[PDB]
Structures are given as structure tokens and as C-alpha cells.
Write a protein that binds this ligand. Structure first.
Ligand SMILES: [Ca+2]
Ligand SMILES: [Ca+2]
Lengths: 223, 222
């Protein structure tokens, strides 16, 4: 079967970290992995040719390994779009897998990618997580605490999130627009459909670069 | 009724941020609120005179407003010690409140302190909080996901945690040693005892300085 990387890049990913755009750092981490067929990057339609320029400029040796495609309005629409681009490259079979990952998580390691791929063999999906270190409070109303979850069972969700392309299409396709609005996480869709989602070990350093503070942390990390 | 600040300081709080220790930064924000009767600081037994010298050196003008006392083995014992220090200073009424706050959260704002005091009026306790940024995943088994709760209902706990001194003492005194181990922060005690704890709005800039990089970030903010 095939294994693809699905890079969600639909913004800080076009910003330089060190001497290369964040997006490039992230794609770089996937190019060495021998078991990856293509690296499929979902970008906002207006930034597709820009993303292609970056590949030409920063990763010319890996041009043919990388497919830039139009992402969607939310992450799951981008995943679907990625899977469609994959299907257009080589018609999907039930066993073909996509390793989905945030563009702004440049500190992913081969160990994480490899664990995700390995876990996907015997499970429906894989979610990369770390132990939650934040104290988490629940409030449905946003006015008072409706409860405090048992912290012993809480994890901070990261990416990759890994699953069979066909499996994601089938489950996502079964959702109403209203359900898609609520079930914004790909693993959540598998979980609520009663599927087996294994935990993969993330890393505290697997930072998501969202805010200008995250950017500062990222810069300090590359030394 | 009196309003007190209860600063939990026991180790980054004694490290310099700009030109002053972080602890002094944190104390200063509470001095900005005129309605605070005393700022009570719980530190490690051996660090009391050190913290006193810090107050003398950096806030001599405000030293009368600050009490340094010996904190405890966990944050809840330190809160207990703080409240006993308050009671030693001025006998408690059932309505005196304590605004408890991490020493290593020096970017607390006046607004946050004010909201905590206001919200404590009509509630059992107050938890200062921000909307959760990460997707939280639950696994009761450590192997597969048992739930991914809706992130829109989830909040990252910060401090201040504010409540009436007597109320804390009453609830805390009713716990066994094992409960006290699981009920690790004040608001958790309140919630499990079926009390009403209001959310106060925190800030994403209300950084808890735990790690070396937190300190680096704090420095860049100042
Ligand atoms: Ca097809
Ligand atoms: Ca609607």
C-alpha cells in the first residue's frame, strides 16, 4: 500500500525560521522518510503558486515528490482535498494511508512519523499526543465550572494524525454540515464513529507556531 | 470584610526579570489594588528572611502592606498557612476573601485582580481561566482514545483562585490525607464539594514561569 504525507497549510507557515520558511522546515522532515510516496500540501488557493515558488527555491531536488494542492475552509476540508489530490495521482485502495500534519509544526521527527505509520497498521487511526501539563477546567456555559476532568487521563493533542484515506472519506462523508462544524478534529470523527484510535507519543518540542510568542520559542529552539 | 492577596511562592520566583526578582514583579501588581488589606506571601521556611530582605530592598515604601510567612509542602497547605497568618494578623470574619496567585505569574493585570474580587462576591470561588488552545484528548486506558471533548467548553486553568478564607478552611479541614493529595488546587476542592465556582477571564500573556524558556520569553515581554 501507499503512505502519503498530508501537510495542512491552509499565516505563520510562510514566515522564515532561521533561513527558510516554516512550511519548508516541515516538508523537509518528511522528504527523508523512505516509506513516503508523495508529500501533498494543502494551501489556500491564493497561495498555491507561492508555495510552488518556495519548493522550487528551497527544495528543487524534491520537486517531483511534492504536490501542492488547494486546501479548504477548515482542516477537514483540507484533508479531503489532500486525499482527492492523492487519488488523482494514483487511484486509492482501501489500505493507502495519509500521515496528516500541521504546516506550523516544523519540529516533528522521523521517529514520530515512523511511529504513526507503524501504529496505523493495526488501528483505525493514530493521534499524536503528549501528557497534558495544563490544568483543564470544563464549563459548558462559560460562566461557572461544570466540571474538572481527571487529569490522569488527559493528553495534549498534537499532529500527526494518521489514517486510511478511504476511511476518512467514508466517515467524513457521512456527516451533515452541522456535524462537520462541531467535529473539527479528524481523530474526533473516528472516535465518535466508534473506531480504534491509538495514541502515538508526541514531544513537548513538537511546538505549533501560532502566535508571535510561539515564533520566539521556535527561534530560541533552532538556537 | 477584608480582602487579602495570597502569593504562593513555596523556584524561578527568586530569579531576576529585567531588574527585579519575578516575585517582586508579582507583589507589585497587587499593591496596585488599594482595597487589598495585606499581601501575604508563602515561601519555603528557609527563604523567609530572604524574601523579607527582597521586600526591604525593592519595595521599602510598601513593606508594611506585605507579610512573609512560611508556606507548606503543597499549594493547599501554603494556602492554609497564609490564612492562619492572616488570622494571626487580624481575626477573620466569614466574609474576608483571599486572592491566591502564583508568585511565578508576574504578568497578572489590575483587571484580573478586580474581576476576581467582584466575582467572589456572588460565588463560592473564582477560577481565572483562558479558552483552551490545544485539542484535549482523553484516554482512560493509555492505549486508545476514549473521548475528545468539545474544545469550546474547555479552559486552561490559571491563577488567581479567589474565595472566602473561612470557606477554604472549612472545606480543606473536611478532607482526608488522600483527598488532599488528589484535590491539588483550591478550585478543585470547591467544585467536588458541589460549590459554585465562577470563571474569571485570564490572559494568554499571564505566563507561568516554570521553565528556562518561560524565563527567556518573560524577559522579552519586559
Ligand atoms: Ca478513486
Ligand atoms: Ca448554520
Amino acid at each position: 500500500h501507499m503512505i502519503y504525507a498530508g501537510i495542512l497549510a491552509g499565516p505563520k507557515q510562510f514566515l522564515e525560521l532561521g533561513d527558510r520558511p516554516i512550511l519548508i522546515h516541515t516538508i523537509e522532515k518528511f522528504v527523508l522518510e523512505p516509506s513516503i510516496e508523495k508529500i501533498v500540501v494543502g494551501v489556500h488557493g491564493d497561495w498555491v503558486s507561492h508555495a510552488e515558488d518556495l519548493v522550487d527555491k528551497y527544495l528543487p531536488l524534491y520537486k517531483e515528490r511534492i504536490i501542492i494542492t488547494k486546501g479548504g475552509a477548515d482542516r477537514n476540508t483540507s484533508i479531503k482535498n489532500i486525499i482527492e489530490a492523492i487519488d488523482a495521482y494514483r487511484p486509492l485502495t482501501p489500505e493507502d494511508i495519509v500521515v496528516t500534519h500541521d504546516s506550523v509544526r516544523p519540529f516533528i521527527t522521523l521517529r514520530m512519523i515512523q511511529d504513526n505509520i507503524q501504529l496505523a497498521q493495526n488501528h483505525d487511526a493514530v493521534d499524536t499526543v503528549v501528557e497534558a501539563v495544563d490544568t483543564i477546567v470544563e464549563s459548558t456555559n462559560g460562566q461557572f465550572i461544570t466540571d474538572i476532568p481527571n487529569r490522569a487521563h488527559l493528553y495534549q493533542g498534537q499532529t500527526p494524525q494518521t489514517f486510511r484515506c478511504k476511511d476518512f472519506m467514508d466517515l467524513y462523508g457521512s456527516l451533515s454540515d452541522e456535524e462537520k462544524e462541531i467535529l473539527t478534529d479528524a481523530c474526533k470523527i473516528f472516535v465518535i464513529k466508534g473506531k480504534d484510535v491509538a495514541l502515538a507519543k508526541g514531544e513537548y518540542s513538537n511546538l505549533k507556531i501560532t502566535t508571535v510568542t510561539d515564533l520566539k520559542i521556535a527561534k530560541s529552539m533552532i538556537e
